């Protein structure tokens, strides 16, 4: 990521803060309804609206992306464990990471319309691409 990208991302993710987990839930919910092929990776989950499990997992995704923003310069060693989980054990199709990153961008738009400028949209797309590249590295 360029220095202009680091700035825009850290600024934008600062202004989420506590709302982080609540936003992650909404992103997962959007993914499940918009792309029903992704629901088969979660047979052990209640996927009904306002589900206890999706709120709880929502916060686990959000915490992961915050650490990434915090460790933006050393991303492959801040997320190393999650590649093994997603690539080796869960066998997650690479196209599915583009689907979540896209629903993640629809959530930040719908919630931070003042900070979702075209230059910030581009920085966040680059950031979520990087995150995806690391998670799929064990392929």
């Amino acid at each position: 990521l360029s220095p202009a990208d680091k700035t825009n991302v850290k600024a934008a993710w600062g202004k989420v803060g506590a709302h982080a987990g609540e936003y992650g839930a909404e992103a997962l919910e959007r993914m499940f309804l918009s792309f029903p092929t992704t629901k088969t990776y979660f047979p052990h989950f209640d996927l009904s609206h306002g589900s206890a499990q999706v709120k709880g997992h929502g916060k686990k995704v959000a915490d992961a992306l915050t650490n990434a923003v915090a460790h933006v310069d050393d991303m492959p060693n801040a997320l190393s464990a999650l590649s093994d989980l997603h690539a080796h054990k869960l066998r997650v199709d690479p196209v599915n990471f583009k689907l979540l990153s896209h629903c993640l961008l629809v959530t930040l738009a719908a919630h931070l319309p003042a900070e979702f400028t075209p230059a910030v949209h581009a920085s966040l797309d680059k950031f979520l691409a990087s995150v995806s590249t690391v998670l799929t590295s064990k392929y």
């Binding site: 909404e26 919910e29 959007r30 309804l33 918009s34 792309f35 896209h102 629903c103 961008l105 629809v106 738009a109 719908a110 919630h111 319309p113 979702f116 400028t117 075209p118 230059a119 949209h121 581009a122 797309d125």
Partner: protein
């Protein structure tokens, strides 16, 4: 293939869409987020920075023409292949645009509806529009098969 209740949420949200802006806003963001797309639009002038692109007069004017073809596509959801017969011919035979990029403008459009509408843009409203833009994207890529 939409349900009655999907179709009536799609059609109901579109009749409040600012037609003179969102089109440009969509096209402008595609050119900034996926910079390779700029090579198809050289004659438009200055695309060097995000500020240049969004305020470019030939971008905003071309945004209206794109959103104008979307508006035709909703009318005729039972016959998109035919509605977009001539646009598929231009885009695939004349311009040689990789279909992977029709999907990308479909999704950039969804981020913009969300941007303007906010909470009125719900997950099930999104899942209806996601169904639309995909169909548009497929119809446009028809001359490639």
């Amino acid at each position: 293939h939409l349900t009655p209740e999907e179709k009536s949420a799609v059609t109901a949200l579109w009749g409040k869409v600012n037609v003179d802006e969102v089109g440009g806003e969509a096209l402008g963001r595609l050119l900034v987020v996926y910079p390779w797309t700029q090579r198809f639009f050289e004659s438009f002038g200055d695309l060097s920075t995000p500020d240049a692109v969004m305020g470019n007069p030939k971008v905003k004017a071309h945004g209206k023409k794109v959103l104008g073809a979307f508006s035709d596509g909703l009318a005729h959801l039972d016959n998109l292949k035919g509605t977009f017969a001539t646009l598929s011919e231009l885009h695939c035979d004349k311009l040689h645009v990789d279909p992977e990029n029709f999907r990308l403008l479909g999704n950039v459009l969804v981020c913009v509806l969300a941007h303007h509408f906010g909470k009125e843009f719900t997950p099930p409203v999104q899942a209806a529009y996601q169904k639309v833009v995909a169909g548009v994207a497929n119809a446009l890529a028809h001359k490639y098969h």
